[PDB]
Amino acid sequence: GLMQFTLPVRLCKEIELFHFDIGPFENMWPGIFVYMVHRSCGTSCFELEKLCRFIMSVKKNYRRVPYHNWKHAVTVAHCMYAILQNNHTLFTDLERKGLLIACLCHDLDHRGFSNSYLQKFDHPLAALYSTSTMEQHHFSQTVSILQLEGHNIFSTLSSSEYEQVLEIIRKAIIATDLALYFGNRKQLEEMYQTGSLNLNNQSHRDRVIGLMMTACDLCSVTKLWPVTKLTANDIYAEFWAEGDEMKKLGIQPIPMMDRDKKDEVPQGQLGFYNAVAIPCYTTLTQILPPTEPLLKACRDNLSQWEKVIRGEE
Ligand SMILES: CC(=O)Nc1nc2cc(NC(=O)c3c(C(=O)N4CCC4)cnn3C)ccc2s1
Ligand SMILES: [Mg+2]
Ligand SMILES: [Zn+2]
């Protein structure tokens, strides 16, 4: 009832900014998340005891991989918190509840390998889920944890509201499959430029939440340069391990995944900013103008990768 989470002053101010970094203190991350839920959603949204038990079971089901870990989950949830806080009136009660949970859960039980690697390995999950393999797995783990004893944070919702929130979470988690992003963003780009984008149209809201999910998921490219650059090392630590596992299956990995091609990382980042990141934050900014700081920070980081190529660092 009367129990608020409060943070130290620097975190209390910086957490509202898009480029906030959650810090190296793992034990403070549950508190930062509950803080965000309380301000994004209400202190009434969830029973504290149930939400705490849920967060700790979610944490326990993230693995100790270099990038797709608990720290990525909380980071992606913080970006969603900053989008929601800058767009107060655009989103429903169920959406505010569902989307922070979706973000915390979106990579549950990730092993550090792409959908492609599971399909080439012939992983059991690639028979159970023929597309968006890992994302259907993450949603499955989310429903699992929701059904543990004392972990139902949506218990106060009706049957039909519960079903709507699990459908928000399902679509939001599926949308983090970057293979689906290209087409989603093209459709949003055409819809916004013919002026047919309508936020009372459920299929349209769905697409706009999908693009938010991509934006939050990629938000390492919207941080201050030293955070962006050190995160990129964790991302490539995973990619290069996948490359090694590809070579164990007798397959030349794509260069993105080949550690022998470490030299090509700056040019690889240019391709990624130009083909994915910049277009993502561009279309997001057209639909939700107060998200422009993510586009600005992404452009600042592309310019830093351009300097790495020109040997100015
Ligand atoms: C020599 C050469 O081609 N290097 C290349 N590097 C890349 C890097 C990316 N992608 C990324 O760098 C990335 C992702 C990303 O794709 N994710 C999938 C799971 C997180 C999320 N954030 N960031 C920065 C894509 C294509 C290429 S080709
Ligand atoms: Mg993922
Ligand atoms: Zn992710």
User: Does residue 17 belong to any structural domain of this protein?
Assistant: no
Read off the amino acid at residue 115: N
Residue 223 located in a structural domain? yes
Instruction: Tell me which H or E stretch contains 279.
Output: helix 278-287
Look at residues 56, 41, 81 and name the one whose alpha carbon lies nearest to residue 145.
Answer: 56
Q: Is residue 269 domain-resident?
A: yes
In angstroms, how far is CA 103 from the centroid of its own chain? 6
Closest to 73 measured CA to CA, from 219, 184, 221: 219
Q: What is the number of the ligand 1 atom nearest to the C-alpha of 178?
A: 18
Resolution in angstrom units: 2.0
How far does residue 139's CA lie from ligand 1's centre (Å)?
Answer: 23
CA dihedral sign, ordered 111, 234, 178, 83: positive
> Which CATH number fits the domain that encloses residue 206?
1.10.1300.10
Alpha carbon of 228 to those of 49, 91, 179, 233, 248: distances in Å?
35, 29, 23, 9, 31
3-state secondary structure of 112: coil
The CA distance from 143 to 242, in Å, is: 28
Ligand 3 ion: Cβ-proximal residues, 5 Å cutoff: 107, 217
CA 169 to mean position of chain CA atoms: 12
- CB neighbours (10 Å) of residue 209? 19
Domain interval for residue 56: 28-310
C-beta separation of 106 from 138 below 8 A: yes
Cα separation, 282 vs 279, in Å, equals: 5
Sign of CA dihedral 89, 284, 223, 31: positive
Instruction: Report the alpha-carbon distance of residue 165 to residue 288 in Å, rounded.
Output: 22
Residue 20 in domain: no
CA distances from 99 to 1, 25, 211 (A): 23, 24, 12
Q: How many domains does the chain have?
A: 1
CA-nearest residue, atom 12 of ligand 1: 269
| 68 tagged catalytic | yes
Q: Nearest to residue 53, comparing CAs of 150, 166, 155?
A: 150
Catalytic residue among 19, 68, 78, 138: 68
Cα of 78 vs its chain's centroid, Å: 9
Contact present, 176 and 195 (Cβ < 8 Å): no
> Residue 9 domain-assigned?
no
Give me 151's structure tokens.
Answer: 């972990």
Ligand 1: residues whose CB is within 6 Å? Answer: 178, 218, 220-221, 232, 235, 255-256, 261, 264-265, 268, 271-272
**What is the rounded distance in angstroms from the CA atom of residue 275 to the CA atom of residue 285?**
16
